[PDB]
Design an enzyme around this catalytic site. Structure first.
Site, PDB file in Angstrom:
ATOM      1  N   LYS A  46      14.170  26.960 -18.881  1.00 39.29           N
ATOM      2  CA  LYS A  46      13.767  25.639 -18.427  1.00 39.29           C
ATOM      3  C   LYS A  46      12.345  25.243 -18.870  1.00 39.29           C
ATOM      4  O   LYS A  46      11.404  25.997 -18.669  1.00 39.29           O
ATOM      5  CB  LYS A  46      13.873  25.612 -16.902  1.00 39.29           C
ATOM      6  CG  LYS A  46      14.205  24.264 -16.311  1.00 39.29           C
ATOM      7  CD  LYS A  46      12.974  23.437 -16.176  1.00 39.29           C
ATOM      8  CE  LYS A  46      12.634  23.173 -14.718  1.00 39.29           C
ATOM      9  NZ  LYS A  46      11.402  22.366 -14.730  1.00 39.29           N
ATOM     10  N   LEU A  54      14.466  24.962 -10.037  1.00 38.21           N
ATOM     11  CA  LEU A  54      13.054  25.106 -10.397  1.00 38.21           C
ATOM     12  C   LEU A  54      12.453  23.705 -10.428  1.00 38.21           C
ATOM     13  O   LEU A  54      13.111  22.740 -10.851  1.00 38.21           O
ATOM     14  CB  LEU A  54      12.894  25.793 -11.757  1.00 38.21           C
ATOM     15  CG  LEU A  54      13.083  27.315 -11.764  1.00 38.21           C
ATOM     16  CD1 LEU A  54      12.776  27.872 -13.147  1.00 38.21           C
ATOM     17  CD2 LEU A  54      12.159  27.945 -10.746  1.00 38.21           C
ATOM     18  N   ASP A  55      11.215  23.593  -9.969  1.00 38.25           N
ATOM     19  CA  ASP A  55      10.548  22.305  -9.931  1.00 38.25           C
ATOM     20  C   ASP A  55      10.283  21.780 -11.339  1.00 38.25           C
ATOM     21  O   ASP A  55      10.388  22.513 -12.329  1.00 38.25           O
ATOM     22  CB  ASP A  55       9.239  22.394  -9.133  1.00 38.25           C
ATOM     23  CG  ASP A  55       8.800  21.052  -8.573  1.00 38.25           C
ATOM     24  OD1 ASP A  55       9.610  20.103  -8.590  1.00 38.25           O
ATOM     25  OD2 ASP A  55       7.648  20.946  -8.106  1.00 38.25           O
ATOM     26  N   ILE A  56       9.930  20.502 -11.408  1.00 39.51           N
ATOM     27  CA  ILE A  56       9.670  19.821 -12.671  1.00 39.51           C
ATOM     28  C   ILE A  56       8.781  20.568 -13.670  1.00 39.51           C
ATOM     29  O   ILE A  56       9.163  20.724 -14.831  1.00 39.51           O
ATOM     30  CB  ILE A  56       9.118  18.381 -12.414  1.00 39.51           C
ATOM     31  CG1 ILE A  56       8.967  17.640 -13.748  1.00 39.51           C
ATOM     32  CG2 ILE A  56       7.764  18.437 -11.731  1.00 39.51           C
ATOM     33  CD1 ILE A  56       9.136  16.141 -13.640  1.00 39.51           C
TER      34      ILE A  56
END
Ligand SMILES: O=c1cc[nH]c(=O)[nH]1
EC number: 5.4.99.19
Length: 234
Positions: free
Chosen positions: A70, A104-106
């Protein structure tokens, strides 16, 4: 190639041995695309419509599991409409059916497990399950000498009744550390460091249970998990 013998599919579908599946097939009870098939070794394709005694027996798409590195700038759900989702990187049919088994965050990067297997997903993400996740953390200031011990005892997040479960912190450089936790609280890593007086500048997930992110999978790249990795990502 996706294919399987007809007798194996019938066995699966009726919950019977392959030998009796063959018996039924030769009993003229099995049809495919409208015609009777008496051959047990018939090569069943995804596009074939199987029926047993006039009743349809739809085939089931196998579950899919992917490992994704990611990148920053993308989100792992459609909750927030201001940012593009990680599906941008996936080039798979009906990709919208995939979800992240552990979001998962940005701007958090690293290992995200994309799948359409809810059971598998739940075993991994459940708040009741002890699943280890390891992160490469970049800090605002050099780590303090008591932080490792603090994390070992477990710290208290701003406004939480119970402390964090014991976590192990390995110091790589004074401002870069590897942290392994077994929980999944909201923004846990960033809050754990805030709690002890530091700030997370960059966060990268390297492992989830028994699955470690490939060293050569570039940000944005992804690939199907192997049978071994699916077999037990913890
Ligand atoms: O485990 C996690 C995931 C995202 N952000 C954190 O601080 N911790």
């Amino acid at each position: 190639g996706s294919h399987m013998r007809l007798d194996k599919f019938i066995a699966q579908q009726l919950g019977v041995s392959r030998a009796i599946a063959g018996r039924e097939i030769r009993g003229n009870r099995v049809t495919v695309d409208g015609e009777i098939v008496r051959n047990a070794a018939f090569k069943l394709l995804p596009e074939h419509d199987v029926a047993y005694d006039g009743n349809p027996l739809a085939q089931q798409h196998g579950p899919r599991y992917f490992m994704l590195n990611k990148p920053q700038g993308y989100v792992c759900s459609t909750d927030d409409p201001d940012h593009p989702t990680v599906l941008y990187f996936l080039d798979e049919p009906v990709a919208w059916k995939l979800h992240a088994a552990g979001r998962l965050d940005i701007d958090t990067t690293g290992l995200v497990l994309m799948t359409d297997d809810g059971q598998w997903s739940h075993r991994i993400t459940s708040p009741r399950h002890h699943c280890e996740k390891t992160y490469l953390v970049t800090l605002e200031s050099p780590v303090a000498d008591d932080t490792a011990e603090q994390f070992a005892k477990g710290v208290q997040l701003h406004n939480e009744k119970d402390l964090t479960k014991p976590a192990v912190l390995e110091v790589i450089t004074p401002t870069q550390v590897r942290l392994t936790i077994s929980e999944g609280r909201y923004h846990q890593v960033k809050r754990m460091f805030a709690a002890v007086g530091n700030h997370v500048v960059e966060l990268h997930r390297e492992r989830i249970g028994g699955i470690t992110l490939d060293a050569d999978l570039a940000p944005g790249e992804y690939r199907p998990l192997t049978e071994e990795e699916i077999a037990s990502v913890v």
